[PDB]
Paper text:
The virion is composed of a structurally distinctive capsid (called core-antigen) containing the genome and polymerase, and surrounded by a lipid envelope with embedded surface-antigen protein. The assembly domain is also unusual in that it polymerizes according to two different geometries i.e. T = 3 and T = 4 icosahedral quasi-symmetry.
In the current T = 4 structure the corresponding Cα-RMSD values are similar: AB (0.792 Å), AC (0.737 Å), and AD (0.603 Å). The CB interface involved ca. 25% less area, 18% lower free energy, and 42% less burial of V124. In the T = 4 capsid, several residues were identified as hot spots with high confidence. In particular, F23 and F122 were identified with high confidence in all four interfaces, and when these residues were mutated to Alanine and the proteins expressed in E. coli, capsid expression was either largely (F122A) or completely (F23A) inhibited. In contrast, R127, which when mutated to Alanine enhances the solubility of capsid dimers, was identified with high confidence in the AA, BD, and DC interfaces but it was not identified as important at the CB interface. In T = 4 capsids there are two forms of trimer-of-dimers, Types I and II. As Type I has the lower potential energy, this form should persist and nucleate T = 4 capsid assembly for protracted periods.
Author numbering:
A (entry chain B), D (entry chain B), E (entry chain D): 1 to 143
B (entry chain A), C (entry chain A), F (entry chain C): 1 to 142
Write the structure that this text describes.
Amino acid sequence: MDIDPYKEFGATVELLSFLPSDFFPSVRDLLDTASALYREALESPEHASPHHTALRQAILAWGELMTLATWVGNNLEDPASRDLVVNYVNTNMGLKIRQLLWFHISALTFGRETVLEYLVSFGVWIRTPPAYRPPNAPILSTL
Amino acid sequence: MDIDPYKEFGATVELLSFLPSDFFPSVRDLLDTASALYREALESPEHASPHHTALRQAILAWGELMTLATWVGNNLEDPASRDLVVNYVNTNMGLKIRQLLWFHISALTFGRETVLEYLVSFGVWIRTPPAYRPPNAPILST
Amino acid sequence: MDIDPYKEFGATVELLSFLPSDFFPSVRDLLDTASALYREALESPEHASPHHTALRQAILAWGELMTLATWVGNNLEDPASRDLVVNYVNTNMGLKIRQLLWFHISALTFGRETVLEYLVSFGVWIRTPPAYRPPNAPILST
Amino acid sequence: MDIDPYKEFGATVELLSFLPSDFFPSVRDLLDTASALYREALESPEHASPHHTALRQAILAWGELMTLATWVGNNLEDPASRDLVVNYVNTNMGLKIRQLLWFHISALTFGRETVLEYLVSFGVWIRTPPAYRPPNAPILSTL
Amino acid sequence: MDIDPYKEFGATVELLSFLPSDFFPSVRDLLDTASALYREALESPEHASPHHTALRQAILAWGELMTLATWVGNNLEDPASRDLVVNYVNTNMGLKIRQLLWFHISALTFGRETVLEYLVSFGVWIRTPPAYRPPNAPILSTL
Amino acid sequence: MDIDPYKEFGATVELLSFLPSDFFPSVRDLLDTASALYREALESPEHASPHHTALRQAILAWGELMTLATWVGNNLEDPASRDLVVNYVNTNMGLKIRQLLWFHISALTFGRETVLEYLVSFGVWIRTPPAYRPPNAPILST
């Protein structure tokens, strides 16, 4: 069970490790986006796509991790350990959760095919060194 | 954002508030059962039933948390915070992950409706004093 | 070569990893039951169901191992190695042979699907703390 | 329950005790043969013939006996007992398991009828003393 | 024989001397992208295109070379020679492996004709002196 | 990417490693044969068959390894490391490249099915003992 979360969505995780951290914007932005755009889809008792379901589970998990951060904030005495822990959290689990959220929400809004083709073109782009790399990378949209 | 992860299956988090904490099992056994019964359906490219997807994401989350715990165990100095964090994980977040995993596993194998009937029958069983309560609470099979 | 002997029946060795060791019964009683219920179908020339074939080969293997144990008991000098080997057989290899025999016997008599349901229901029963667990775990019959 | 493992395959064990040990080659050769030729049949969750099923069970049993040998190798102090035990193993259980494996795999590759007729002719052959016995015994093939 | 490997696909090594070295990105990025895209089709027991087959052979070649690198790292004593071997490998032979990977992967995604047109357009781009050279080097897209 | 390159042609490294290593000829004679027969087809602009393509890429890999060999021979100072590296190459990677080249060449000349049958028959020949084995090993041909 080395399970790939994207295998049922056509892609893999090695695909997405090509592109950097900074392209993934803040967790709070993605959560607010998801809420504002698809609260009707999330809260309703009908699953339109498995993207929505994994999105629900990821949002719940991230809420639990925020509870973890708060609990460690309100109980531990050593500032070093607390800072190190929250740094690890908001860096690495931030990376992974932002990745997952971006993929699911992008595939919903713009379509699975378009996202896969975008990631193909981006993997071709960023894998080019600066000399022959264009300065303004591809951007995402439907048509 | 105020989501109940069970809203899409007819169930509700309040419905599991019937069940106590101690009832749900250790995590290692759950993961072992899940793998040994559904390895091929998990790793394969198919969302044959969305319970599979929830199980995928839950297992990945628990792996992420185990990586967190190991990272903390092999980097920090004060063992107080270390053991405290490990305890907090394995108790409190273990509760949520156990809830979610148990539910989705039971729904995969035995069926959603039968699981709902199991939960409500257990709530009837436990909303009852000890004496007239039979000592063999319901456990499920087909 | 990495074979699971249960792969051909929808089951999996990981699925039996739910069950503990002590649960499965002594070997002599299993062999007695097997013979007394299926002597004619075993010795007869017919592979009416492949569980019969697995049972044949398993009984022959256990007879081979009992012959091994007797051969060691009536040829060696140091009783340490003697009793050690006998213990190792009757515990560790007994585990595998008991697993295999119990499964194939239950599948012969009661049915493959019902046995799978039995295993998963037992896993639900045991992935549960002691208190809310009923003290009458499922046992099977028709 | 003096069960014959071959009664459901047309033959018996007294049939095969006519022919010698040496005709059965090494266990490792047979296992590697079985793997190389029919890993797709073994590992798949579909039983094509009861030969395959008994083959699975025999391979698992032999793996367990190898585990037995290793365990005795790693725990006992008396070299005499260890050597005697492993000798018994690789001689006698070697004989039986090689017999079983050869029969099943041969019947699969070449057919049950051909194997039974081969064993008939061989029992007629080796049961002849050297004077009137041919020097180059029968060999196995389809056509 | 000095086979021109790109000869089946209308392309040349002369066509690749248009491109500089730095244009090709790091090998780990290539492998990660290739995995996350087409891991299933690679491990799939089917030859979808000769591109796939050459890609499989090249991945195995790189695996052999990295295994060699690890062996030499874990057994050799003369350190300057060791480091020089490692750098020589991962630069000089990594270059050609990157050429191979990039070509076949881009041909899989976007098509052979498109890659050829890309290469000749890039040649027109770089063979222009830097003054009147436009600032945007072309890249690829399904847009 | 647990890749086995022979999957495109109905075989595996395990099916191929069923033979010993000594059977596999030296790489030099293989390149001699392959060149002196199919140089015109392999340098051609034509994907005549995937066997040719795997052969092309494999020959590139081996030529590049020989380039490495010459670089090492003409640029290191410590001859011990030179010997270790070079003989390690021609043993370990020599084995794999020999296997690959022989497979694809045999498939070109005689045909895929025939080479598979030859592997099977030769292995069953060589592992079976000589007395009851056929007197001569089979040798593949149309």
